Design a protein around this ligand. Structure first.
Ligand SMILES: CC(=O)N[C@@H]1[C@@H](O)[C@H](O[C@@H]2O[C@H](CO[C@]3(C(=O)O)C[C@H](O)[C@@H](NC(C)=O)[C@H]([C@H](O)[C@H](O)CO)O3)[C@H](O)[C@H](O)[C@H]2O)[C@@H](CO)O[C@H]1O
Ligand SMILES: CC(=O)N[C@@H]1[C@@H](O)[C@H](O[C@@H]2O[C@H](CO[C@]3(C(=O)O)C[C@H](O)[C@@H](NC(C)=O)[C@H]([C@H](O)[C@H](O)CO)O3)[C@H](O)[C@H](O)[C@H]2O)[C@@H](CO)O[C@H]1O
Ligand SMILES: CC(=O)N[C@@H]1[C@@H](O)[C@H](O[C@@H]2O[C@H](CO[C@]3(C(=O)O)C[C@H](O)[C@@H](NC(C)=O)[C@H]([C@H](O)[C@H](O)CO)O3)[C@H](O)[C@H](O)[C@H]2O)[C@@H](CO)O[C@H]1O
Ligand SMILES: *[C@@H]1O[C@H](CO)[C@@H](O[C@@H]2O[C@H](CO)[C@@H](O)[C@H](O)[C@H]2NC(C)=O)[C@H](O)[C@H]1NC(C)=O
Ligand SMILES: *[C@@H]1O[C@H](CO)[C@@H](O[C@@H]2O[C@H](CO)[C@@H](O)[C@H](O)[C@H]2NC(C)=O)[C@H](O)[C@H]1NC(C)=O
Ligand SMILES: *[C@@H]1O[C@H](CO)[C@@H](O[C@@H]2O[C@H](CO)[C@@H](O)[C@H](O)[C@H]2NC(C)=O)[C@H](O)[C@H]1NC(C)=O
Ligand SMILES: *[C@@H]1O[C@H](CO)[C@@H](O)[C@H](O)[C@H]1NC(C)=O
Ligand SMILES: *[C@@H]1O[C@H](CO)[C@@H](O)[C@H](O)[C@H]1NC(C)=O
Ligand SMILES: *[C@@H]1O[C@H](CO)[C@@H](O)[C@H](O)[C@H]1NC(C)=O
Ligand SMILES: *[C@@H]1O[C@H](CO)[C@@H](O)[C@H](O)[C@H]1NC(C)=O
Ligand SMILES: *[C@@H]1O[C@H](CO)[C@@H](O)[C@H](O)[C@H]1NC(C)=O
Ligand SMILES: *[C@H]1O[C@H](CO)[C@@H](O)[C@H](O)[C@H]1NC(C)=O
Ligand code: NI
Ligand code: NI
Ligand code: NI
Lengths: 173, 319, 319, 175, 321, 176
């Protein structure tokens, strides 16, 4: 996809993540765990919601009938009307096809971008204390317990706390 | 070493949607943009409506028995039903569809007496079995069938003038009787050559009753063809005739605006709606619909598609 | 230090396309979305078609000599040519264009005898040099020119009724002869005042032959004006006349649906197509075309552009 | 461009790359070489192809003529028809202009993104064994022979094999 | 020492403007510009146009020659301007397919007139006039027509034949009238007691008319009426009038030349602005692709939309400090 | 936003930057300063300008009136005309809404991308001599005077000049 994450360098989605659209799985000495990210999830959802609300905005144009359902219409004018209506219908059918195709393309790619934005945010938090594995994980070069993991998700992880330990491990010096 | 992995959600069964590049793109969720479902009733809540029943709109102006309860009124919504009756005595109206549309576009009708009077050699109370009322021969309520008082006598040269003293235009209708045989024409109007002239400052026309053999409709080989025009405020319109005129006793006045609906769907006074068609009402937030290209009111746009799904989620990538 | 560099392809000469922000964007490849090229032939493969040749659609109903091979038939496609003949004896048809469109929208025509018969003082075999057939004076195949058997005699008061006993509506045409001099009208129909009345349960009308000096067309100062209506299933239509009626010997029945084409392009039975215009056929996968705004069938949409190029590659960035 | 690679930090395209849309050039002790990347090339092409197939989808709406080519049209109705047709034509001309402009913008930027996706994929494979030069190349801090280069293109390059050698070289103090 | 720094950023403004996107109705950006024109010019911008202002002359009056149209019987123009309450008829009446005819004229680039050459025998008076059409303080008539009546009051109008032959290479538009008297006495005075009939016939057209007596309100002091009819005569064709009283005959036919733009507006002419778009209220000069002034415009116009405003962003998201 | 910079990891814009759309602020021993980036600014502006010029491209279709302002229109044909015109108007109103919504979305995101493109360009120039703080700054691990700062903006910064000093500072291996 456009941003390379969803159906990209992330091999698949997580069916087991039911409390959010984006989130984290971790591994440490204590074990493994999962948690959703609220902000990225809301960013995606709010854009979808805003898009849906734009689509309910309706015409306030009152139309009268120009074709009698229960009596004869003179043939020439009837043919003109038919030609006009079918032309209008082809225009609206095409418009709807295009609208949906375009919106869907944008929706998909926007979601991909919000996944990437979360990835990038975490990459920068971790600074020189972790390395990317190419599959969406960050190998963290210091002991990072459940609280430490929480501080990464919560965006309060202070890289300078663990920097020295992490650089030694990254270099083996 | 320790590890934190980023990811997104997925579902077991996603839904298919179309994009610019892919007709078969699977996403986690989607929602319909084309309404398929209408309400098979006429949703009239909040509308002062008139259900014409078996009365055809044109019958309101001329006063067919079926339209007796619909000779005047006020409405914001007017409902026409299939096989509604316009004519009891058979005939046709010139520019009938234009006239029907004027009525179905109105917010009510009022009636004003012409005040037409006739000399003693005219019988202005002509009736027919074709228009029954109270088990007796009758006629269009808003018209008078003028015939010679004495059978066979020449109908006298006659002049009648309607003067619009209102501040709004009035719609005047009249008829011309076309007999089924020369004997019949002679009985009703005499042997003289017949001619009806109509003239205002804006309108001029002339009509000639014509004898001809024809199939019976409601037991009548005769016909009454109807004509109409608009009389402006302060204008006079003059009928000059010597037999064959079906004269107006009242003229009409179309008032305000209203929405006209053609449908046999039953009225429901508990739902409200802004969109109607032959099959009933359409209440939907969706911008498109595939129910019908013939709708009235404020409607979603018609498209030739069963379904157009709008994605409401990311690409689905299952495990 | 060793090195691996990433890159993309380019070409020496790219093509220009338009984007949202740039009218002059160069890309590696592009393809046309507007069709400029049509086929200057009528592609009739897979179509049971009728080429009317020199026969005008309206001539099919009345039976002009040019239409002798086109009085009945079945087709899914009907082809009209420029300068096709509708009338041998000069005249005109009321609501001609509506009628032409009905025919060009049909999938075939059948003919049904009226069964009209005439007393001995009527000559129903009127012919004219204007309608030749086999080197002899003839007449519209589906009509009969009724005149008095004895020159100068009053044409008798006559009644003819067609009864539609079918389950589908029939299209009935007739003519009214308008003579070029009073002498001529007297010769053909007598000195009496002439009148033709036509009446079904849905239709009523009346016609009067009218003498007038006029230029000759195909050697004729006379005229025959044509009229038509639809007779519903189970209905009767009655002609009441005493001279001047050009009566129908057969009525028509339009069957099914077909596509009507106006073009002089030659037929090709080896290409197939869904889109036609004056100049021929349009076979293209492209969604747009700039050949003509007047097309018929299933066509690409007309746009006022010579070309609209769709990019099929990346930005071209040459070395 | 949107993704910064094509007509961006990549100075130009390669006219000499005729067997793919995206790919690699390398330099090592054995010499230089070139190879196309199949996956990124197919990703781009499949999206273009899918777009083209969507654009062939035609109306199945049969239209009749409402203007006689060979006879007179009454003037008022003729004018109404003309007004209507020209309005419809303006709508379709505008639609086509917009469609193409929009699709072209998307096509161009999608191609840019696939180039970037390949770049990013390689960056992550190489991990701490290489550095970016800013022009689209990765300077690899260990001896990387033709097989090693192939393993990068083939996506089987194991960074841990060369990590120690590479970190030592990266921490070199040069003149 | 610890690290120096360089920070990247973008601009912002104190007060941004709101625009709509696909996902947000209320998106703030640094700058935006209107795409829907709200402002028109309340004048007819005629610079660069050879125009004709018909004034109080109605287009149909040009063809028949009403006094009000005396300065508009022929001409050339690329733009034709019709005003409200313009006069078509001096003697009261109506025209068949009047709106089609008006549209033909308002679509033309000029009018020429060609004499029919019609002449009449001694028992016809072809100089009928009326107080309804004044000209120079005297009773007159439509300039391009002749009111034919019997020379001797009460005499039967003679059976008469007049044929116009189009010898041009372009079609001509021929108009004529039928007089409908207000009483039998009047009809008898003018045309005699015979039954009246007017037949018109070319190789393409055939029709017939009958004067009809009827009581009617006076319009411009006249209970009588003259109804007008028209058709097109093709090059090389003849059209023949066959009549015995009631015909208002053409002394000249018309020829519509080229193309021109027809405007209905009472806005005053300004010969200093130029424009391609007009409506009832005046002109529309704008580079913008849309407008909300009127759905009834003529010329080359921006498309009408039911929106007060649609702002197009010309800058990034505004993110103030 | 789509590219994560504007209204993203950049907390806010700079109202004080009036000579460009994108640019730099720095801090060193000599003090602080600000400067606009011409290229990224022009890239954004040229795309907006090109978009505006596309929007002035007008129809050359001459339309006649089909509705008389000063006389009666027959009712049926008048109704057909009204139906047709209002349908056309609804089509154009919808088109304009969509056009502007779509263009605005693209404009906003394009601007975001040009900001990011500048950020990425600088990241790569600086190579191993600086680290990202997550808020759009690069902490530079060597003394970078006004000329050095200019060389970063001017795109002539040679990372190998300062590499040794910078790596020592990044590892906290500076000799006592
Ligand atoms: C009460 C009465 O006078 N006649 C009864 C008949 O109505 C009924 O048979 C019907 O007669 C029809 C023709 O007769 C009328 C009519 O329309 O009913 C009689 C009207 O009085 C007469 N109206 C006027 C104003 O003259 C009217 C008129 O002449 C013609 O409609 C003109 O074309 O004709 C017709 O034959 C029907 O088929 C029939 O139902 C009989 C039944 O036996 O009883 C009568 O008492
Ligand atoms: C009786 C006859 O045929 N006499 C010969 C004349 O035809 C001819 O003079 C020409 O007459 C022309 C009209 O002739 C017909 C026709 O159209 O062919 C003759 C038809 O039999 C007659 N048909 C009927 C049903 O009455 C038909 C009809 O009266 C009129 O068309 C009605 O408008 O007329 C035509 O007017 C020529 O212009 C005229 O010169 C002369 C000279 O050749 O010879 C006669 O023996
Ligand atoms: C001054 C003069 O010539 N005649 C005076 C009469 O006009 C006047 O009677 C009035 O007649 C009015 C209509 O008169 C005309 C007209 O239209 O002006 C007179 C025209 O010469 C005559 N033209 C022709 C070609 O016939 C014209 C025509 O007959 C009718 O318009 C046909 O409908 O009529 C008008 O009706 C007034 O109401 C009437 O009083 C008399 C007084 O009796 O004095 C004359 O000097
Ligand atoms: C205009 O289109 C309508 C709808 O397609 C036509 O009405 C149909 O006509 C067929 C005959 O081909 C009938 O069997 C159907 O019952 C009709 N359907 C509806 C919904 O009315 C109509 O005939 C067309 N008018 C003209 C003049 O071509
Ligand atoms: C409707 O438009 C058609 C097509 O433009 C007009 O037909 C053209 O008439 C012009 C005269 O101005 C001629 O130059 C051409 O020969 C015609 N072109 C075609 C393709 O037929 C037609 O006149 C218009 N109808 C009305 C009533 O305005
Ligand atoms: C077509 O639409 C126009 C505009 O809505 C209608 O114009 C109105 O016409 C009546 C005259 O009978 C006036 O009282 C209104 O004020 C007019 N409004 C405007 C804005 O012009 C017109 O009536 C419609 N035609 C039909 C046949 O319904
Ligand atoms: C799918 O979409 C609609 C609209 O956003 C929503 O109402 C529904 O709850 C959604 N279903 C999910 C998230 O499973
Ligand atoms: C038509 O005529 C037949 C035979 O006379 C008759 O039985 C039928 O009822 C008639 N149909 C009508 C009058 O509609
Ligand atoms: C905003 O944009 C318009 C159109 O690009 C431009 O003319 C105007 O100068 C701009 N306004 C400001 C305050 O920058
Ligand atoms: C209508 O008649 C009255 C007198 O009954 C008259 O005063 C009025 O002027 C007439 N109106 C017209 C238009 O003739
Ligand atoms: C008009 O009349 C002349 C008289 O000789 C004739 O030559 C010409 O052909 C006629 N035009 C026709 C019949 O179109
Ligand atoms: C674009 O040009 C290529 C040559 O690379 C040609 O083969 C192809 O037909 C063109 N594009 C498409 C979509 O066919
Ligand atoms: Ni049809
Ligand atoms: Ni035109
Ligand atoms: Ni209306």
């Amino acid at each position: 996809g456009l941003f390379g994450a969803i159906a990209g360098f992330l091999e698949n989605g997580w069916e087991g993540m039911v409390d959010g659209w984006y989130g984290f799985r971790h591994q440490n000495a204590q074990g493994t765990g999962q948690a959703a990210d609220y902000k990225s999830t809301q960013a995606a959802i709010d854009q979808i919601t805003g898009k849906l609300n734009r689509l309910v905005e309706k015409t306030n144009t009152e139309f009268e009938s120009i074709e009698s359902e229960f009596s004869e219409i003179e043939h020439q004018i009837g043919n003109v009307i038919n030609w006009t209506k079918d032309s209008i219908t082809d225009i609206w059918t095409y418009q709807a096809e295009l609208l949906v195709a375009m919106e869907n393309q944008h929706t998909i790619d926007m979601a991909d971008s919000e996944m990437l934005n979360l990835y990038e945010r975490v990459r920068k938090q971790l600074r020189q204390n972790a390395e990317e594995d190419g599959k969406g994980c960050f190998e963290i070069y210091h002991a990072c317990d459940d609280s430490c993991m929480e501080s990464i998700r919560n965006n309060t992880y202070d890289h300078s706390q663990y920097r020295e330990e992490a650089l030694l491990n990254r270099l083996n010096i | 070493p320790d590890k934190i992995c980023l990811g997104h959600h997925a579902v077991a069964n996603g839904t298919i949607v179309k994009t610019l590049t892919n007709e078969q793109e699977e996403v986690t969720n989607a929602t319909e943009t084309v309404e398929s479902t209408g309400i098979n009733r006429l949703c009239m809540k909040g509308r002062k409506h008139k259900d014409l029943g078996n009365c055809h709109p044109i019958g309101m102006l001329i006063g067919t028995p079926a339209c007796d309860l619909h000779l005047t009124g006020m409405w914001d919504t007017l409902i026409e039903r299939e096989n509604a009756i316009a004519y009891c005595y058979p005939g046709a109206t010139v520019n009938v569809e234009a006239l029907r549309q004027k009525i179905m576009e109105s917010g009510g009708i009022n009636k004003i007496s012409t005040g037409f009077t006739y000399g003693s050699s005219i019988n202005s109370a002509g009736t027919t079995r074709a228009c029954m009322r109270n088990g007796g021969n009758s006629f269009y309520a808003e018209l008078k069938w003028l015939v010679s008082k004495s059978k066979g006598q020449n109908f006298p040269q006659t002049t009648n003038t309607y003067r619009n003293t209102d501040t709004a235009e009035h719609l005047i209708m009249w008829g011309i009787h076309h007999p089924s045989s020369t004997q019949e024409k002679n009985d009703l109007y005499g042997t003289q050559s017949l001619s009806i002239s109509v003239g205002s400052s804006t309108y001029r026309n002339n009509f000639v009753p014509v004898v001809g053999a024809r199939p019976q409709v409601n037991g009548q080989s005769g016909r009454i063809d109807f004509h109409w025009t608009l009389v402006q405020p302060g204008d006079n319109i003059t009928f000059s005739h010597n037999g064959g005129l079906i004269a107006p006793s009242r003229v009409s006045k179309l008032i305000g605006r209203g929405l006209g609906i053609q449908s046999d769907a039953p009225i429901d006074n508990n739902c409200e709606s802004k969109c109607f068609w032959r099959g009933g009402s359409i209440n939907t937030r969706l911008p498109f619909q595939n129910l019908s290209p013939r709708t009235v009111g404020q409607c979603p746009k018609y498209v030739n598609r069963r379904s157009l799904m709008l994605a409401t989620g990311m690409r689905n990538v299952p495990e």
